[PDB]
Amino acid sequence: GIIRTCRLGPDQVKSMRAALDLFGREFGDVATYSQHQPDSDYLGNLLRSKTFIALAAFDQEAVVGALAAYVLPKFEQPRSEIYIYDLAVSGEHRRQGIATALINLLKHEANALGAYVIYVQADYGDDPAVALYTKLG
Amino acid sequence: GIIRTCRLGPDQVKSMRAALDLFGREFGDVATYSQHQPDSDYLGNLLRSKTFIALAAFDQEAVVGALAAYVLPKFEQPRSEIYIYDLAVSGEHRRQGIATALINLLKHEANALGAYVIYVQADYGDDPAVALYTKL
Ligand SMILES: CC(C)(COP(=O)(O)OP(=O)(O)OC[C@H]1O[C@@H](n2cnc3c(N)ncnc32)[C@H](O)[C@@H]1OP(=O)(O)O)[C@@H](O)C(=O)NCCC(=O)NCCS
Ligand SMILES: CC(C)(COP(=O)(O)OP(=O)(O)OC[C@H]1O[C@@H](n2cnc3c(N)ncnc32)[C@H](O)[C@@H]1OP(=O)(O)O)[C@@H](O)C(=O)NCCC(=O)NCCS
């Protein structure tokens, strides 16, 4: 099959948008992730920052997995923490190690970035007004 | 005897440090918030950024309340969410409406920023590897 992963840059706004559509489909909320996407200048600036990380997995050059995380530059100490906000894999590519692959790339990014920890969603998904995270490390 | 609140700017690094010290005492972890604080260049830059908000409440010109929050520029839509990371009030100034006042100031900052929602870190405190947030 061959699934490739990479960190999206300001030059890959198109894949970023494709990753957003995947989020919409996997979360059962297409409107939220596909009908009100920000413009390209905004998406380009976001992907250009060092405190936001977008990871995508490709199958036949189509987005099949996406990971969106934020880097929190801390105030108490000169250190940073990563929080995986959204993570989803195509329903047709589950249990293949894709999310695992995105997270390993994320760890690669964290190390280069210097982040000392990574939090993930202690998901049940339903979480309307609640958002729990667990320490991946 | 009158509690004043305001958002800290790059020109108030000293108060930011005092707010940090406050977090250490009230959270029962002085070393983490007081022994390894970032240098002034770093605090200055953090305070000059628009995605970070530090609020402090004073009593006789001493920091007695502090609130540190991050603004997340969203990816699915051009909107932002605010997450209160740390919030604490002097142990000797509890139930005086200081947190409530810091929170109201935060809503003000959020509104001026356009943020459509604010979350607060679920506090049973103890939560080591489990950060939880609830909508405010
Ligand atoms: C949760 C989700 C992202 C996982 O995607 P995925 O690509 O199927 O996940 P993976 O195949 O990489 O790994 C799944 C499991 O198999 C395990 N695994 C990975 N590679 C493995 C291998 N080679 N051998 C054995 N087990 C393996 C992983 O540890 C994981 O176990 P765990 O969930 O108990 O921790 C996916 O189901 C999804 O998109 N769900 C909807 C959105 C959602 O709820 N997202 C929240 C994510 S925190
Ligand atoms: C929790 C804390 C910040 C509140 O201090 P405070 O300034 O005395 O609170 P206030 O006088 O403004 O308000 C009094 C009560 O109204 C409640 N309240 C006010 N606005 C509220 C809101 N929007 N949502 C929920 N509760 C609210 C508070 O929970 C508080 O009850 P409590 O003392 O049993 O916790 C303070 O006790 C503290 O510093 N605790 C240690 C650190 C901690 O637990 N931080 C987590 C904060 S979420």
From TrEMBL, chain B:
Instruction: Establish whether keyword Thylakoid is in the entry.
Output: no
Output the Gene Ontology terms for molecular function: acyltransferase activity, transferring groups other than amino-acyl groups
Binding residues for CoA 2, per the UniProt record?
L87, V89, R95, G97, A99, T100, Q121
Any stretches that span the bilayer, and where are they?
none
Query: What are the N-acetyltransferase domain coordinates in residue numbering?
Result: 1-136
Q: Which UniProt keywords apply?
A: Plasmid, Transferase
Q: Which residues bind CoA 1?
A: V89, R95, G97, A99, T100, K135
Q: Does the keyword Lipid biosynthesis apply?
A: no
Q: What is this protein called?
A: Aminoglycoside-(3)-N-acetyltransferase
Q: Which organism is it from?
A: Serratia marcescens
Tell me what gene encodes this: aacC1
What is the covered span of the full protein?
A: 25 to 160 of 177
